Amino acid sequence: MMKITSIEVFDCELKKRDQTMSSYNPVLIRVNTDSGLSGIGEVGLAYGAGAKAGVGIIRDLAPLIVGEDPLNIEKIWEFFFRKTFWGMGGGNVFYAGMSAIDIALWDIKGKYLGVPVYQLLGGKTNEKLRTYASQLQFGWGDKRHILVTPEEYAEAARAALDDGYDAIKVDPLEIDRNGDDCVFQNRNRNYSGLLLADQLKMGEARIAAMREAMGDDADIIVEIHSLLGTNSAIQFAKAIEKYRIFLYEEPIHPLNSDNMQKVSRSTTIPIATGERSYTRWGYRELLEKQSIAVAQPDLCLCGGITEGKKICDYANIYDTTVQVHVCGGPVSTVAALHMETAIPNFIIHEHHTNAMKASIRELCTHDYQPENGYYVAPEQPGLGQELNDEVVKEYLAYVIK
Amino acid sequence: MMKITSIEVFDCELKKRDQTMSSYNPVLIRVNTDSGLSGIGEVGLAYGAGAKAGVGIIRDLAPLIVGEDPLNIEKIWEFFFRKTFWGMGGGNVFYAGMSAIDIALWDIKGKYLGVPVYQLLGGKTNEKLRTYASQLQFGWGDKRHILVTPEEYAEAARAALDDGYDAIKVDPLEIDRNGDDCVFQNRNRNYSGLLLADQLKMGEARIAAMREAMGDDADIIVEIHSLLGTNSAIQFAKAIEKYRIFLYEEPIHPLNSDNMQKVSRSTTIPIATGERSYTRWGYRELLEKQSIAVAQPDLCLCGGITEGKKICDYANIYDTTVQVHVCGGPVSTVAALHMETAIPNFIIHEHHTNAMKASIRELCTHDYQPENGYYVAPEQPGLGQELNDEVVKEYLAYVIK
Amino acid sequence: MMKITSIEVFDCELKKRDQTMSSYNPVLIRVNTDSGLSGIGEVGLAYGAGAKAGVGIIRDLAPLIVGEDPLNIEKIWEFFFRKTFWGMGGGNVFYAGMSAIDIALWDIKGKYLGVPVYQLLGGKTNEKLRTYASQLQFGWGDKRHILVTPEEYAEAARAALDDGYDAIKVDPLEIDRNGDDCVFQNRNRNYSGLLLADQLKMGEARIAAMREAMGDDADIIVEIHSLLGTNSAIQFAKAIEKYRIFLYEEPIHPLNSDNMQKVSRSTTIPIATGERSYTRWGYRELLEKQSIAVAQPDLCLCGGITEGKKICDYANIYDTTVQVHVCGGPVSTVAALHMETAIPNFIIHEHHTNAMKASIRELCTHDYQPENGYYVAPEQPGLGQELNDEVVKEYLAYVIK
Amino acid sequence: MMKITSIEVFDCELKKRDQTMSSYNPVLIRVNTDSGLSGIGEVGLAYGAGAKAGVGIIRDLAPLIVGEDPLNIEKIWEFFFRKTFWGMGGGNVFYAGMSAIDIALWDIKGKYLGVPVYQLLGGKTNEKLRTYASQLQFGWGDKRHILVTPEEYAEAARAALDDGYDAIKVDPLEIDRNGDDCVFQNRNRNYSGLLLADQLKMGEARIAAMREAMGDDADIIVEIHSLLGTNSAIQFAKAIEKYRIFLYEEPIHPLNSDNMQKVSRSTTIPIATGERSYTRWGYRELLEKQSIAVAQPDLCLCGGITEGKKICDYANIYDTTVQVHVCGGPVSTVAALHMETAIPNFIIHEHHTNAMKASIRELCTHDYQPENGYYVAPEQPGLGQELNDEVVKEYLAYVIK
Numbered sequence A, B, C, D: 001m002m003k004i005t006s007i008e009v010f011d012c013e014l015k016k017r018d019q020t021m022s023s024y025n026p027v028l029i030r031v032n033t034d035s036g037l038s039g040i041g042e043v044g045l046a047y048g049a050g051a052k053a054g055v056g057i058i059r060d061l062a063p064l065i066v067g068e069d070p071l072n073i074e075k076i077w078e079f080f081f082r083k084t085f086w087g088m089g090g091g092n093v094f095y096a097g098m099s100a101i102d103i104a105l106w107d108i109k110g111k112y113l114g115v116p117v118y119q120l121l122g123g124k125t126n127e128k129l130r131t132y133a134s135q136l137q138f139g140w141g142d143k144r145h146i147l148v149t150p151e152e153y154a155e156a157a158r159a160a161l162d163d164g165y166d167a168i169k170v171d172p173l174e175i176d177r178n179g180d181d182c183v184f185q186n187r188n189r190n191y192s193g194l195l196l197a198d199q200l201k202m203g204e205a206r207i208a209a210m211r212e213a214m215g216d217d218a219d220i221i222v223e224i225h226s227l228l229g230t231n232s233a234i235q236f237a238k239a240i241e242k243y244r245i246f247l248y249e250e251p252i253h254p255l256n257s258d259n260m261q262k263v264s265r266s267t268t269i270p271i272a273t274g275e276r277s278y279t280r281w282g283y284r285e286l287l288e289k290q291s292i293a294v295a296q297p298d299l300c301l302c303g304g305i306t307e308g309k310k311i312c313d314y315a316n317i318y319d320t321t322v323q324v325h326v327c328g329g330p331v332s333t334v335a336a337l338h339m340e341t342a343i344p345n346f347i348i349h350e351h352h353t354n355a356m357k358a359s360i361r362e363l364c365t366h367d368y369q370p371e372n373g374y375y376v377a378p379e380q381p382g383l384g385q386e387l388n389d390e391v392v393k394e395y396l397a398y399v400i401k
């Protein structure tokens, strides 16, 4: 019945509207059909080096589905995987392109069938979703800032708890002594080997101050952003084990799965990873080797809602539970909410400190925010979001038709 | 001393100048310095879905090295790997971006030191490079089109041998009975399970015709483009073993390394793969599991000349030899020539049936072609290639500065 | 262009000039060409039983390259590995001979192209190199003698920290209660089974006093010289874990790689080894079994600069960082400096307590010493050293031509 | 009561007395005592690059045992292993030094106790020793030269059979079409990857001609000299399986033990190796991985008679039988004979094609040769050999005292 007619790509250079958001660049899409139904998706490359590559991949993929039936979601996914060459040897950019399209197709399918996406994923398994305040090294607040001292870290923790959260995530090593950012700047390159006394102390003092301010019951997730190597990851874990750490996220990159297993066998802190792992194939070795307690696929990278569901289902057989990685526009948030509502192995939801920024919220028509440390799913047909056209018109980059 | 001043990106939509090359789109770069020395690179996404993403990644990566010293090649490489977020969770597009820049930096360094790149890679190890005629399902020489019948395959084989080659590569399953292309069209989807009788016979009859036309001594490489799955790959290998097959290329994709090992253990034909494997980390499980005889990294995808050399050095300890994957512009060709000249574990060089096309050759100022089945290295400083400005001006897409 | 014309071998029997240096016997070489460019190298057998074998292996290897083009460094390396019989079943002596030659060729190539060796290895990755004060069981500074009591070890530690180091290495079990040396004398043979109470107390008391003298921040590397066996290596590690040990070096010999793995799994102190491990092939089992945090190839043993770099590149994929082993003449020091400057996985640099000895220094024309705990690379073309002909004339043992 | 007084080292440059033996250079020692008893030994580096290194290692090791009691053979061995630094990371040269001294000490102990060495090794287990004619690529008997054509190979085979041998060994790939020698010349470098058709035919034609000339009952050992890599080793084995091959020797080098296992699992021809494998530690991974049917330690390399016996005893538990590697002077021959007479897991004895050369035989006072394809042990006290001082005075290089 329906056919895809066009795909709009939005290159959301947020610096155009808010200079505090200088680096951040969500990439959003809208898939239109000849029935009048449209669906929105997101390419999960809003931070780091990749936004322009993300726009480009939609230009490479979208032409293949113009004129095609949007309802054959498995077929479309499999075509991208099998018949594009790169589908069988992809990566963050290629799978992100597949993801954005997949999400927009689920949106269309939900609207067509008149139900929220979680209904098509298996129904309302989880009525409310425990949520954590994410990345407190950038503070907890409306704007806030790069935090350096343990007291500043403790204050962000107190602010998260006052806001109703009973779980927080922090990278205690990302920010160096001078307030520089080791994720994106050439600082503390020795992190990949072994930590120096001062660095160990810097990270531990921040965690220690946060635990003290939070009390014992609230949970702390320690994020590492793959800054450490196998040996420093273990060295640091042993320093922070005394603080009862809930999860250890991305203690090393996922490119060597045997090293990930080694880290997991070497600390009592359960390991989380997944934002930089894509497709069921990207999880096979992590799961088989029993290296992770929590999988963190980004639905805007891992292959979308179709593949994301499959990742969750697979993780379940290894007792691996799921926290969707969410750090982008409002589309990533609703995709995650529908997924986490339906899956039986949901553990916790990530609410990023930037998700409250006006320049991010204004990209879409609805605001979905946690209340008292919990999220609920949207209830309208499809994803329950639309692009805010008054804003996104400034960001329109390409229309594929 | 020197600083990078700008990076030009060329989106080589060949269809603008030659309609017959419609779905081929090399992506080239030029890195310019304040000394007047320039270097050229290539993003290895000339086919499949990815050219526009490849243009985009250069826009994402290039701004990070404007103003920087081009001579610190290991440092620039490591910074892209470590400090961009996605470098540690990359893929074909991200590592292609890194590759192009790296190749351009080697070009600069060679010109700066007054010697060809092979000298910087360890000197002249191989004086001449045995070369094969690549992808004969698309014909050789005069008759350039999709081949279907066994006699058409035998004719292409004779033509390659007439052209002085003593080795060919063919995918005998890519083209179906009707002349449709299974790599890029939804045809023969059952390929990934088990082959039907007609398909097995189709493939084997083409190989039979070619062996018969070539005599027993010339080598046949069977390319599969990852079209088969574990079970059908083993199935077909058994049907073609009798023809004395030199290598079996990409019998399945590389996303499940345990399946690759199983294929390797189930056929006597040695396995080759690597065009969809990136960086040392992408080879670790293939080599450790002793799954491949020959590695085929593409220097325009795998992380460039710096990482390519490292992959070759690594392969060597497993008795794995190297044929660089070459299927793009003239930049990929010279990058490969220098690599293969320097490495001790070189096996054979790939000469693609398209590398003789006018619209590819005109991209660069020099023509380097094999003679009597052998290649030799360029001898000028750097890569020994320049872009043909008269042509590439039509393709200039972005200038980063 | 050029041909190798002659190779000089210097049997540097230091006792001929300095009776205090009696055991020590650096072996140096100079490779001369018909262009007037010469390069120097070193065979890394200055201590233990091996110096005269080291002179001999150059007599065996050098004739093979007289008249050959020195720039083909990979080709020369591969020839020695492949076509001498013993290259494929070598060991400390054979690979040491290859090493010396390889280092001299890098010197030549740097000179010819007019740049320091680090530029040919990939550029200036590390602008300065953190350095440790090495082998404090023989004192530091004013006191140049065999240390016995915990208080003496504490005094050495203070001296090093006063000299501006923030890291030290000590072997706390090498010297017995009577001041005898278990590395070279038949004492404490029970070390390779299980330690006796007094021995355990002896070692731990020395570490305890050093940690107390140093404060908590400075790093301690514990050197074992392969004196312990698997079971005593673990037993001692558990006794010294409480002092926060940075690395545990050569806890056992590397001849049984499974035992090395077992030691690494049985202590939380990260393992370093590599001075008695040669070529890529000598690290394969160490790396694959994930047994080492730090690789310590000696560039004058492991196969030279060409093979050393490949070892560092390989190490990196297992998050193994590099401290080159340096305990010889000034040639070893500069080869290490160039290597450590270029590699992204450098961790720390070894400065031996004997490196300031007049009889070692006078072998060469320049001095390169650390300052405030840091080394920088030479900046001259090639290695940045020449032989001091007024001294080495008396060590000249052979001229191969 | 006895003490070692001196150690003479003989650098047997046979070219001084015989130009046809041009490069071949046995290295012999004699260990003298204050009791007037002396023992002789050999450093196993007579061919390839290493004889001068072999002379040097005796100069390094011998001083350590002057004044010591020769009878403590395990103690001396263990001291060289443990207290020399390099003993715990040695290789062919270092362990050859140990070996020569060890063999000399067994000679002494046998003379002291009035019995042949085989008595001290466990008595007369094997009364006669099946012997094969070794290295027929260099002809046999009347026609001693480099063989190229299959007819030449068949003729050497007949000659050996007419000489009373029922087993032969040949390397069918060492000599190229032009009579060049791939073991010591840069020829057929592609051997380490995959064989070309011509090379496969060349090798198989030579084996085919020998089998046809020999009949079906006589055994053929195929020697490869580690010239092949894992992939070509398997490729070649498949082509010659039809000729009923007794053993496949050194199909690849022993530096990657996982590759050796792979080769062993991929051909039905039983594998032999060991001449480039030293000490018990050098056989551990070969044995544990069940990669070898026959172990071939050289007693003049592997650690001598003490360690050789331990290697034989270890091999036994894996059903691995022993052929001692013998290609040196007459001392190597008698050490082998004694060992093989005593061990229960002897399989076959190697009789080298140059064993009857005048310049080889004249080094020693006795001549032990096979008859009708069988060797027997010497029956004199000790090894049953003395040096021929009239000849070896011309070769004396050093006397350590």
Ligand SMILES: [Mg+2]
Residues within 6 Å of the ligand: A223, A225, A249, A250, A275
């Ligand atoms: Mg994260």
Ligand SMILES: [Mg+2]
Residues within 6 Å of the ligand: B223, B225, B249, B250, B275
């Ligand atoms: Mg291919």
Ligand SMILES: [Mg+2]
Residues within 6 Å of the ligand: C223, C225, C249, C250, C275
């Ligand atoms: Mg050491």
Ligand SMILES: [Mg+2]
Residues within 6 Å of the ligand: D223, D225, D249, D250, D275
């Ligand atoms: Mg042999």
